[PDB]
Design a protein around this nucleic acid. Structure first.
Lengths: 130, 145, 159, 15, 108, 74, 177, 66
RNA sequence: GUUUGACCUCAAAUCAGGUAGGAGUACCCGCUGAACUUAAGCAUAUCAAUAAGCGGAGGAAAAGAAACCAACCGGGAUUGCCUUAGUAACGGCGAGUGAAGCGGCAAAAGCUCAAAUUUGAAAUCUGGUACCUUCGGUGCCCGAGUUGUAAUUUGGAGAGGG
RNA sequence: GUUCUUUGUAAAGUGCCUUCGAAGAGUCGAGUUGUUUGGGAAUGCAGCUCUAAGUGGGUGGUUCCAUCUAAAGCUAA
RNA sequence: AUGGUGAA
């Protein structure tokens, strides 16, 4: 070429890259339990069957639990606002458990929230207090 | 006394081999009417309500290779399906037509439809060609010379 | 030469009525972006340390308005004649006639903008009103229906 | 060319 | 005049791809669980193949929800329809097993 | 087709509202006159010509009668 | 919700209201330049429904073009050439004279931080969209390229040169077929 | 298919042509030509000539009444 | 008020911030477009929806989530490959031209507007400026914007309420 | 993994019950002049003339039945 | 043929 020639001629130096090992030997990234139980000498599919988990979910074209236990192992192991709570105190100390009167009130129940909405909040507020 | 008008209509999708037959038959017939397009069915009886046409010629469009043609009348006319693979004309017919009502009735229609009534809006006094009607192997053959 | 539904405009509201419209309307100013902000900072100062009623102000988006006419929320409608595409409003005086909503073409598109903190407005409408001015509104309406709707019954005709 | 716009639809107010 | 000299390389291209997609998606299985479908026409109707996606209907009857399905690596096609009762059963059976198979890691 | 297009009260209104606001285009301005003198027969003829298909013109001439009839009486 | 009435108003085009508006503007635009900026898009419904918003960065141009390749395209093509920094988004018809047709083409500043920021649009800032109209990627160019879905567009569905080269060049595998 | 309604169609639709002159009808009914006698129906040889002969002989039946 | 102020429109500046051009061009996208040559002379068929010329991009481009294909116990965005197939189909049925659906695989991913009111509060953004942990955040001011900028919704419905 | 902070009557999801419920026009379409193809149901596009509908509209199959929803947009491999 | 460089 014209442009290629200059480069070999020049004393600038080519932008030499040795990136050909890494296209094959790929490190697993996403999961740490898998990471220690993943033989790189083995292939992708071969590695999966040594585990237990399926690699493919359809019928493949052409032919052919120690780790998976550790995966079920990781599978076994919110509050209310400072004003909202204080506003709930105001309701309970006024009506107690009279939600109907509470729902038709104007001075404390502004945003006209229904009984179900109101009592839900109350049951919650009672759990952090009395 | 013989006063009849022809009407030519075509469905969406007509060219080459079918349009060559439409454009030339509309030209060879002086009482012919050339309309834009149509798509389905009962409406066809209401087209004749406008132009006072006593005849109709409808070309259908189906399976991409075939041909379908419908042929009817204004008031209470019956229909026959077809499947074929400006001088005044003279008609010529066959013995096999008058053998049965299946072909005698089509002989009646083709006389006043495909032919010509004399008192026409584009009628020329001179003669040039003769029409060829005959039946062999259940189907009709048409050529102009 | 003008088709009747265009230049159903240009036959606007008169001087004395117009001012009296704004006499009412300038009473119903929307809060300014400065004012709204300070109000809320006043709230934040208060509500961070230790009730209000719904506030009447006029309504001003073309959308919002075309919503409001046809839904009966609207009482009075003000429509500016000079608009970049006239078509953007030509239907509007008829729509109102059809929903029976009192309308008046006002003169000065900028003049609407005044009463609403904006540059222009094309259309503003007073939906809901204070108790004291309730009567003031309904009378204005009548005034408008006399000097505008009844005076120009032939605005739908004549080129 | 210049017929008066006969308001065939706005004549009747909507309820 | 094109010649596929690459046939060799391209496979070894495609393979590493599958490898890296596997490195990225580690415990998951590369592809989404597709349905089971009866192919069109007289020539083929004897055959049941894979289809594109499970129907919202199939999905709803299996025990899970449209969007959530997508996030559990189930394909969902919305234009496919449910006309064949024998198909419908066969897919819903394939999903419920899938849901017995899956082991879904939490967000903590 | 499940969401075909039920009429809607709002849209119907708007169509008619616009139908009356705009007035009538020149061919239609000719068309209503062609109804009032030469009859529905000759009216459809121009309509079929001026638009594409007869089905278009038929539905058009039917809309014309709805305008003319509702205008003079009501 | 004016855009229902506006829409339906714009349908009735030869009718008396819109008819009179044409003869005014057609004179008014023949006063002004060839290609120029217009303040607010004259048929604003259409502008909305072609992806114009009334925010800083969207720029409407009005363009005039001779009567008798297509018009709508050349309309865009000509404005791109002038207003170089902007991408064309779309265009639409406004007015036809006897000799000239007019289009209100819409444009976006990709360089404006108002469009660089917002999610719904910043796709247009992507350098794969430099001169959309100069590659028939506008709605009109995409139409003239006969790019649709069906039986009708079988010889031109995915590149009309892409389908010619695919057929007119012999292909051979290592283990010949 | 049935021929009961076919004969009902020979009533209303079919117009008389014998009461009127040949001027209005202008249609020659070439009888006795059965044309099933044509040798070679596929290759198309006698089919061209027998149809050509039926056409030109019909001209002279109409020529006398012209 | 024969003053004065709104706006609208047109300007202006060696103001502040930006950006377009040219090169390369194998590939991709448009546009334009022959001739030697093939059937016997040449208007189509044929060289050829080529070469040259013009315009425009990218690491690919283009295409793309049905106004799709089908006639079935239906498929289900797109692109490619194998096949369908030298088939259907067209061609002074001749130089010959020449698909597609299905099927098998490669790869797989879906989504955003315009649409009916935040109207009990334009809830949104550009910029300027002062700081800060600076591919930005914040306050304060300026504008843009109601000829509609945010939230919600895109038919797979969806929204209002309970 | 390690922590520092999470808040506001905040943001959604699911099932049931009730009350509503809008989807792109000088475009589709039609006539004609050219271009494109091997395109027979002028296919596709352009120009020019005219120019629509909402229990709609587009496309296909024997008198119905199936199929999608144009005239806006984005997008890896 | 296309596209170019020259020129009493």
């Amino acid at each position: 070429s014209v442009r290629k020639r200059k480069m070999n001629r020049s004393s600038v130096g080519k932008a030499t890259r040795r990136n050909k090992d890494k296209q094959r030997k790929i490190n697993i990234q996403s999961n740490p339990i898998i990471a220690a139980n993943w033989d790189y000498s083995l292939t992708m599919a071969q590695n999966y069957k040594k585990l237990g988990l399926r690699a493919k979910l359809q019928t493949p074209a052409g032919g052919k639990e120690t780790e998976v236990v550790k995966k079920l192992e990781e599978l076994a192991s919110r509050s209310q606002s400072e004003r909202e709570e204080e506003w709930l105190e105001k309701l309970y100390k006024k009506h107690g458990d009279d939600y109907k009167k509470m729902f038709f009130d104007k001075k404390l129940n502004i945003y006209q929230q229904s009984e179900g909405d109101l009592k839900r909040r109350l049951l919650r507020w009672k759990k952090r207090n009395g | 006394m013989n006063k009849q008008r022809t009407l030519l209509i075509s469905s969406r999708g007509v060219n080459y081999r079918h349009r060559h037959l439409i454009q030339d038959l509309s030209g060879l017939l002086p009482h012919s009417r050339k309309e834009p397009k149509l798509d389905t069915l009962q409406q066809l009886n209401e087209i004749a309500e406008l132009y006072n046409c006593n005849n109709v010629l409808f070309f259908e469009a189906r399976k991409h290779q075939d041909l379908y043609l419908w042929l009817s009348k204004p008031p209470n006319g019956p229909t026959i399906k077809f499947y074929i693979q400006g001088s005044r004309p003279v008609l010529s017919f066959d013995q096999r037509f008058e053998s049965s009502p299946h072909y005698q009735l089509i002989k009646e229609l083709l006389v006043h439809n495909f032919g010509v009534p004399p008192n026409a809006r584009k009628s020329k006094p001179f003669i040039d060609h003769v029409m060829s009607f005959s039946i062999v192997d259940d189907k009709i053959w048409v050529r102009t010379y | 030469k003008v088709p009747p539904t265009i230049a159903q405009f240009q036959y606007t509201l008169d001087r004395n009525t117009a001012a009296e419209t704004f006499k009412l309307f300038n009473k119903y100013r929307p809060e300014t972006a400065a004012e709204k902000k300070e109000r809320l900072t006043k709230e934040a100062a208060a509500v961070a340390e230790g009730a209000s009623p719904k506030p009447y102000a006029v309504k001003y988006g073309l959308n919002h308005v075309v919503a409001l006419i046809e839904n009966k929320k609207a009482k009075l409608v003000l429509i500016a004649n000079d608009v970049d595409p006239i078509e953007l409003v030509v239907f509007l005086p008829a729509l109102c006639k059809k929903m029976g909503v009192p309308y008046a073409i006002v003169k000065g598109k900028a003049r609407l903008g005044t009463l609403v903190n904006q540059k222009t407005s094309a259309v503003a409408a007073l939906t809901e009103v204070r108790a004291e001015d309730e009567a003031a509104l309904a009378k204005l309406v009548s005034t408008i229906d006399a000097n505008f709707a009844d005076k120009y019954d032939e605005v739908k005709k004549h080129w | 060319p210049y017929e008066p716009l006969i308001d065939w639809f706005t004549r009747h107010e909507e309820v | 005049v094109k010649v596929h000299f690459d046939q060799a390389g391209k496979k070894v291209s495609r393979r590493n791809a599958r490898a890296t997609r596997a490195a990225k998606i580690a415990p998951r299985p590369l592809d989404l669980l597709r349905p089971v479908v009866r192919a069109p026409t007289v020539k083929y109707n004897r055959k049941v193949r894979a289809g594109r996606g499970f129907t919202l209907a199939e999905v709803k009857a299996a025990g899970l929800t449209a969007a959530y399905a997508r996030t559990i690596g189930i394909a969902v096609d919305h234009r496919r329809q449910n006309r064949n009762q024998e198909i419908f059963d066969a897919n819903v059976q394939r999903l419920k097993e899938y849901q017995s198979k899956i082991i879904v890691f939490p967000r903590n | 087709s499940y969401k075909k297009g039920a009429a809607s009260n709002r849209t119907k209104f708007v169509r008619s509202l616009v139908r009356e606001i705009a007035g009538l285009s020149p061919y239609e301005r000719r068309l209503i006159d062609l109804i009032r003198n030469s009859g529905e027969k000759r009216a459809r003829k121009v309509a079929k010509k001026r638009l594409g298909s007869f089905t278009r013109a038929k539905a058009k001439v039917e809309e014309m009668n709805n305008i003319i009839a509702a205008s003079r009486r009501h | 919700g004016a855009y229902k009435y506006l829409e339906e108003l714009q349908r009735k085009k030869q009718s008396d209201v819109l008819r009179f508006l044409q003869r005014v503007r057609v004179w008014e635009y023949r006063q002004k330049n060839v290609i120029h900026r217009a303040a607010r898009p004259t048929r604003p419904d259409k502008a909305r429904r072609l992806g114009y918003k009334a925010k800083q960065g969207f720029v409407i141009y009005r363009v005039r073009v001779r009567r008798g390749r297509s018009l709508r395209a050349t309309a865009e093509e000509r404005v791109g050439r002038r207003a170089a920094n902007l991408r064309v988004l779309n265009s639409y018809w406004v007015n036809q004279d006897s000799t000239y047709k007019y289009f209100e083409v819409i444009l976006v500043d990709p360089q404006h931080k108002a469009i660089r920021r917002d999610a719904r649009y910043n796709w247009i800032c992507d350098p794969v969209h430099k001169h959309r109209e100069a590659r028939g990627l506008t709605a009109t160019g995409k139409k003239s390229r006969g790019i649709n879905k069906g039986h009708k567009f079988n010889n031109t569905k995915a590149g009309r040169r892409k389908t010619w080269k695919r057929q007119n060049t012999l292909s051979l595998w290592r283990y010949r077929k | 298919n049935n021929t009961k309604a076919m004969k009902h169609a020979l009533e209303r639709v079919q117009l008389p042509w014998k009461k009127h002159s040949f001027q209005e009808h202008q249609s020659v009914t070439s009888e006795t030509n059965t044309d099933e006698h044509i040798k070679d129906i596929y290759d198309d040889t006698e089919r061209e000539l027998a149809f050509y002969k039926q056409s030109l002989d019909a001209v002279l039946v109409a020529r006398d009444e012209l």
